[PDB]
Amino acid sequence: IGIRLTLPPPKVVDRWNEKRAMFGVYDNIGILGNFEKHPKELIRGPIWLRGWKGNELQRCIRKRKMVGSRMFADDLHNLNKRIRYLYKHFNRHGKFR
Amino acid sequence: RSRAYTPPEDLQSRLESYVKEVFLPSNWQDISLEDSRLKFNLLAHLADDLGHVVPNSRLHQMCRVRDVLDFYNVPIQDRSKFDELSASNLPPNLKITWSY
Amino acid sequence: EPVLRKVELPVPTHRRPVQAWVESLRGFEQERVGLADLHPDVFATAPRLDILHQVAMWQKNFKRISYAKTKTRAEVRGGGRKPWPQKGTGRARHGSIRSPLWRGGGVAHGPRGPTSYYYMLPMKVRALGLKVALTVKLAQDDLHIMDSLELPTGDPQYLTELAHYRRWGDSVLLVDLTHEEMPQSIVEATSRLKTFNLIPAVGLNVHSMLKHQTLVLTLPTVAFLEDKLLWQDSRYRPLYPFSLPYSDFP
Amino acid sequence: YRARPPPRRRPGPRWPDPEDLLTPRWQLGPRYAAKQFARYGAASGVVPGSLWPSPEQLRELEAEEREWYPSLATMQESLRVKQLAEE
Amino acid sequence: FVESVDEYQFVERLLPATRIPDPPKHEHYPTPSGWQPPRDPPPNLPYFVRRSRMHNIPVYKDITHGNRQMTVIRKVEGDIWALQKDVEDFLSPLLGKTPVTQVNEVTGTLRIKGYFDQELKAWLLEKGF
Amino acid sequence: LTYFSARKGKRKTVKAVIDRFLRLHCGLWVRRKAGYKKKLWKKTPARKKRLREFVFCNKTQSKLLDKMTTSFWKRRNWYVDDPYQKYHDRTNLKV
Amino acid sequence: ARALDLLRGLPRVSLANLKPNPGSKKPERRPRGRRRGRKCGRGHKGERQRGTRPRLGFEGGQTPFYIRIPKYGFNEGHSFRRQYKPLSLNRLQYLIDLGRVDPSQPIDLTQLVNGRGVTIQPLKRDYGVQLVEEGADTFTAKVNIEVQLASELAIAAIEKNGGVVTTAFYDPRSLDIVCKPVPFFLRGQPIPKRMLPPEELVPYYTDAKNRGYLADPAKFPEARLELARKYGYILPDITKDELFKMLCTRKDPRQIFFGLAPGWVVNMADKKILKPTDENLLKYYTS
Numbered sequence A: 001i002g003i004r005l006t007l008p009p010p011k012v013v014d015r016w017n018e019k020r021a022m023f024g025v026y027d028n029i030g031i032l033g034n035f036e037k038h039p040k041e042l043i044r045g046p047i048w049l050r051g052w053k054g055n056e057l058q059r060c061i062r063k064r065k066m067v068g069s070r071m072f073a074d075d076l077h078n079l080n081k082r083i084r085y086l087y088k089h090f091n092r093h094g095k096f097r
Numbered sequence B: 001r002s003r004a005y006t007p008p009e010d011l012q013s014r015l016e017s018y019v020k021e022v023f024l025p026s027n028w029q030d031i032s033l034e035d036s037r038l039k040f041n042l043l044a045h046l047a048d049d050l051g052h053v054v055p056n057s058r059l060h061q062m063c064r065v066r067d068v069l070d071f072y073n074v075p076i077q078d079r080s081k082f083d084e085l086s087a088s089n090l091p092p093n094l095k096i097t098w099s100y
Numbered sequence C: 001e002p003v004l005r006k007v008e009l010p011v012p013t014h015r016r017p018v019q020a021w022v023e024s025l026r027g028f029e030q031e032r033v034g035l036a037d038l039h040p041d042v043f044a045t046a047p048r049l050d051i052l053h054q055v056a057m058w059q060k061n062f063k064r065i066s067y068a069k070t071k072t073r074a075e076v077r078g079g080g081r082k083p084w085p086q087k088g089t090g091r092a093r094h095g096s097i098r099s100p101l102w103r104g105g106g107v108a109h110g111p112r113g114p115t116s117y118y119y120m121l122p123m124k125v126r127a128l129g130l131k132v133a134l135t136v137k138l139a140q141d142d143l144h145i146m147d148s149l150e151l152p153t154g155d156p157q158y159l160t161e162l163a164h165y166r167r168w169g170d171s172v173l174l175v176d177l178t179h180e181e182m183p184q185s186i187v188e189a190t191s192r193l194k195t196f197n198l199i200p201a202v203g204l205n206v207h208s209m210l211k212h213q214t215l216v217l218t219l220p221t222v223a224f225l226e227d228k229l230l231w232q233d234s235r236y237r238p239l240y241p242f243s244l245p246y247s248d249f250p
Numbered sequence D: 001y002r003a004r005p006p007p008r009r010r011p012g013p014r015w016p017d018p019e020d021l022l023t024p025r026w027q028l029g030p031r032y033a034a035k036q037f038a039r040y041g042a043a044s045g046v047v048p049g050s051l052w053p054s055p056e057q058l059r060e061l062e063a064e065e066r067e068w069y070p071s072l073a074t075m076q077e078s079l080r081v082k083q084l085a086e087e
Numbered sequence E: 001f002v003e004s005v006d007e008y009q010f011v012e013r014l015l016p017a018t019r020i021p022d023p024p025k026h027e028h029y030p031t032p033s034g035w036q037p038p039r040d041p042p043p044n045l046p047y048f049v050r051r052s053r054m055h056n057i058p059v060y061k062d063i064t065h066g067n068r069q070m071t072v073i074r075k076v077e078g079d080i081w082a083l084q085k086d087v088e089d090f091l092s093p094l095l096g097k098t099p100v101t102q103v104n105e106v107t108g109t110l111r112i113k114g115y116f117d118q119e120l121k122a123w124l125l126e127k128g129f
Numbered sequence F: 001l002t003y004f005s006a007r008k009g010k011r012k013t014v015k016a017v018i019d020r021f022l023r024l025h026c027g028l029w030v031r032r033k034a035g036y037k038k039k040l041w042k043k044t045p046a047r048k049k050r051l052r053e054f055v056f057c058n059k060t061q062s063k064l065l066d067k068m069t070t071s072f073w074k075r076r077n078w079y080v081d082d083p084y085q086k087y088h089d090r091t092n093l094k095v
Numbered sequence G: 001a002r003a004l005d006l007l008r009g010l011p012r013v014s015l016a017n018l019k020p021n022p023g024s025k026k027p028e029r030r031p032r033g034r035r036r037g038r039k040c041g042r043g044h045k046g047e048r049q050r051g052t053r054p055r056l057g058f059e060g061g062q063t064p065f066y067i068r069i070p071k072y073g074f075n076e077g078h079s080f081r082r083q084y085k086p087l088s089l090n091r092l093q094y095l096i097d098l099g100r101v102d103p104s105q106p107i108d109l110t111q112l113v114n115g116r117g118v119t120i121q122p123l124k125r126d127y128g129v130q131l132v133e134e135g136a137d138t139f140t141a142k143v144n145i146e147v148q149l150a151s152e153l154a155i156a157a158i159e160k161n162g163g164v165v166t167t168a169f170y171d172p173r174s175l176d177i178v179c180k181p182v183p184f185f186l187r188g189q190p191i192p193k194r195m196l197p198p199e200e201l202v203p204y205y206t207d208a209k210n211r212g213y214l215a216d217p218a219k220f221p222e223a224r225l226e227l228a229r230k231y232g233y234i235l236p237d238i239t240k241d242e243l244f245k246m247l248c249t250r251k252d253p254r255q256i257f258f259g260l261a262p263g264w265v266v267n268m269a270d271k272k273i274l275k276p277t278d279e280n281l282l283k284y285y286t287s
C-alpha cells in the first residue's frame, strides 16, 4: 500500500530569504543602465547555454562544439551517439511533414 | 493615529477660512489649484488640522477648491469586520465569532 | 518651505501631470514635506495587468536553467546483448536488460541535460512593464516619494516603527539613485531587515515591486525613471546596439 | 537587505597574458590591439603607429590591387575593345 | 607616422541620433507629402488619439486568414465607446449598414472590418488628432 | 528533407527545388513545362507553343515547395533589370 | 481614466493575482484519456503510425513532382546579381518634411541611413539605393542626393526643383562602412579607399545622361538641358542661388566619407584623427 501513514515534516519556507527578497534585481540593467550590459550577461550556468535556448539536438551540437574538446572520453562518446540518434529521429521520424 | 474620519459641521467656514488665509474673492469654490505652492499650503493646512490627508491616488483629482470640499466630507470609517458585522444589528439567531 | 519637483520632460498637451506628496524619513511623524508632480505617461498609464504578467513571468523564467538530466537506454551501464533468444523461451522478446521497461533501465522521455529557458521580450515591453508597475503602485496608494533616504539614526527598529506609524505595509522596497551614494544610515538600517530592502535605481524590476507591498522612491530616482522610461517612447529603431556611440544617447 | 552592487563592465582594456594557454588566439593578435585602441583611445590602448600596414603588408596590398582591381584606363580600354569586336 | 589633428567635425555628421526629431515648422499645411501636425489646442472630444513615434496618425490595415481585411485604430486614450459610436456613424453611409467593430477597452484599440484606412486617417485629421 | 542539420541545427533547402522553380514574392511558384525540349519534330506547333510557357503551380505544389526551401528564398529581391519583377506584387485580387 | 479609479477599490496587485491575457495561452494537448490518446492521433498501424513516413517530396514511387520538371536557370546566378533598395521621391519628400533628412546638407547614403529612411544590408548583396520615379509630381524639394542608380524621370524631378543628382559606386566593403560608420570606427582600421566599378558598370558611371560620378563635368549641362527639354520645364541655373556651394560638393572617387580621407584613423575615444605621414602610405591611400 504505497501511501505513507504519518504526514511528513512541515516545509518551512522563508519567503524573506536573501535570494527571494533580492530576486529579479538587475533584470533591467540594460534599459535603465544605459545599455552597458544585456540581462543575458546576468545569468550563470553552463558556458554553452548562457543566453541561448535550443531544443535537445541543438543543445548537444552546441555543447559539443563549445566544450566538447575538454569533455571526458565516454561523455564525449555518449554525446556523439546522442547527436547521431537525435539526428536520425528529428530528421526521419514523426507525424508532420 | 486611526484612519477614522468624521467631517466637521463647520467645515465650510473652516475650509473657506484656510482658502482666505492662503490668499479671497467671491465664487471661491471655483479657484483652480494649478499653482503647486497654493495646493501644498492648502492641503497641508487641512491635513495638519483635520488629521485626514488627501492620498497620492487622489491628489491630482482636485483641480478646484470644490473638489477638496467634496473630499473632506466623505466619512472614512475604519474598523475591523468583526466590529462591522457585530454592529450591523444582527438578528437574535446570528452568532459570529472571530478565532483571531 | 516646500519641495516642489515640477516635471522636467515635456508632457503631452492633453494630459496633466499626476501629483504625489514628498515625505521624509528624518521625522518620525513628518510626512508631507513638499509635493512633487510626476509624468503621466510613466505614473498614470493604462492599468494593463497582462503586461505585468508578461514581464513577471519573463523575469522569473529567462535566467532559469534546469540541471535535471536522466540517463537514456544507451547511457545506462551494460545491457549490450540479448538476455535470452528471440523465440525458443516462453518469455517476452527482449533486446537488452536496460530497455525502459526493465527495473534499472533507461528513461524513455526524461529530462535531458541542462536546458535553458532563455527568451527576451522586446525592450519596449519590459519598459512598459516598469511603467505599469509604477502607475499601479501609485493608484493603489502604495507609492511614497522621499527627498532623500536619510534617517536620524541607524537602528532597524526606528525604520520599522516609522513604517508602522505611516501604515506602509509588511515589506518596503526602498530605491535610491546609485549604489555608491546611498546614505550610511539607511544602509545600516536595511542591511539587517528581512523585508525592507535597499536597491539602486538600476536594480528596479517588476518582480520585486509586486513582491513588496510598498515602494519608496526618492526624487532623483523619480527624475531618473521618467528619463529612462520616456526615452523608449520617441526613439528610433536601432541601427546598432545602444552600447555603441550615438549622436545623443548617454 | 541591501542589493549587492550592480554588475558593470571593466573600465579599460583587457590585455590577456600571451604565455597562457587558455587565452584564445583572437585575443592576442594585432586586430585585438587595434580594436582595443578603437574602444579605449590612445591613453589606454596601444602605440598608434601599429594601425597602418607595415611595408610587407603594404606590398602585399599593392600586389593584390595590381592583380584584381584595374585602373579606369585599362577598364575603359577593354570596353573599347569589346565594343569594337562585338560591333 | 602619426600626426593627430582635430578635424573630427566630419565624424560628428556620421553619428545617428537616437531620439526621432520633432518635425520642423512649415509655412503652410498640409506638407507636400500630405503630413499635417496635430492641432493646438487638443479638441474637446470625450476621446483622444495619440500620434505614433513618427508623428503619423495610427490607423493600420490588418489581414488575417488571407481574407479578413480589417483596420485598427490604435493609440486611443479616453472613452473608446464614443469613438466607436462616431466611427460607426461615419462609416455607415459608406456601407449602408453599421460597420462591424470590436473595441478593446484594455489596450485601447478599435477594430473595424474592411479596409477604411485612408478614410479614417482623413477623418481623424479633420477631427484634429 | 533535413529538418535539423548536424552542424547548425537549421533547416536545409532542397536544391533540386531551387534548380527547377521560381518563387515569386506573392507565393506563386513558376515552372517550365516537362518535355519542352524533347522530340520537337513530332509535336504540333500549338503544342510546342504550349510547352514553351512559364506555368504557375498548384496550391499544394506551392505549399510543398515552400516547405522544401527556407526563408532566404522567400525574401524580397530588388534586382537591377529583373525580367520577373513586375510579377512579384499581386495586383487587384478580390480574394 | 476611470480605470485607475477602479484600482483604488481593488486589493493590491501581487504575485498571487496575476493572470495571462485570455487567448494568450492555448492549452497543451497531451495523449491521456479517452479522447486525446488511445491511438493518440496516429491512426491505424501502418507506416505513419510507426513513425516512418518517407521524406518530403516522395510520391510513393512515381517520379516526384519536383523532379519530373526540367531544370531551368531561374535562380542561376542569384547571389552575384546586384540589388538596389528603392527610395521613391514620395518617400524622400516624406523624410524631408518630418526633419529626418536635412536637405540643406548633402544627402549621402549615411544620411538616409541615420534618418532611417532606407534600411540597406550589404550582406544579401544590396549595392545601395536606387532612386525611383514614384511621386515625381508632388516632389517639391531642393536637394543634393548621391544615389547609386537613378531613373531619368527621378533625375528630372530633382533637377527641376533646383536639385543635383549624382550616381556614386560602392564596393560591398565600402557600402558596409558607409551605411553604419560608427561600428567601423570601433574596428580600429584606417579608412579604406572605395574601389572603382567593375567593367559592367564603368559605362554606367561614366555617362553624363545618368549623372555618373566618373563622367565629365563638361557634358552635364547638355544632359540637364536635354531632360529639361524632354519633360517640359525651364532648367534653373544652380549657380545663382545661395545653396550653390552646398549643391556642388561631391566627394571624389576613392573617398568613402565626406570630409575625411582614406588612410585616416578615427579615434572615437578622445575625439582625434590620426593621419599617416609616411610616403609609401600616402602613395597607397591617395592612389
Ligand SMILES: [Mg+2]
Residues within 6 Å of the ligand: C073, C074, C078, C079, C080
Ligand atoms: Mg549500449
Ligand SMILES: [Mg+2]
Residues within 6 Å of the ligand: C095
Ligand atoms: Mg536490438
Ligand SMILES: [Mg+2]
Residues within 6 Å of the ligand: C104, C105, C106, C107
Ligand atoms: Mg533508472
Ligand SMILES: [Mg+2]
Residues within 6 Å of the ligand: C071, C076, C104, C105, C106
Ligand atoms: Mg537508472
Ligand SMILES: [Mg+2]
Residues within 6 Å of the ligand: E061, E062, E063
Ligand atoms: Mg497584421
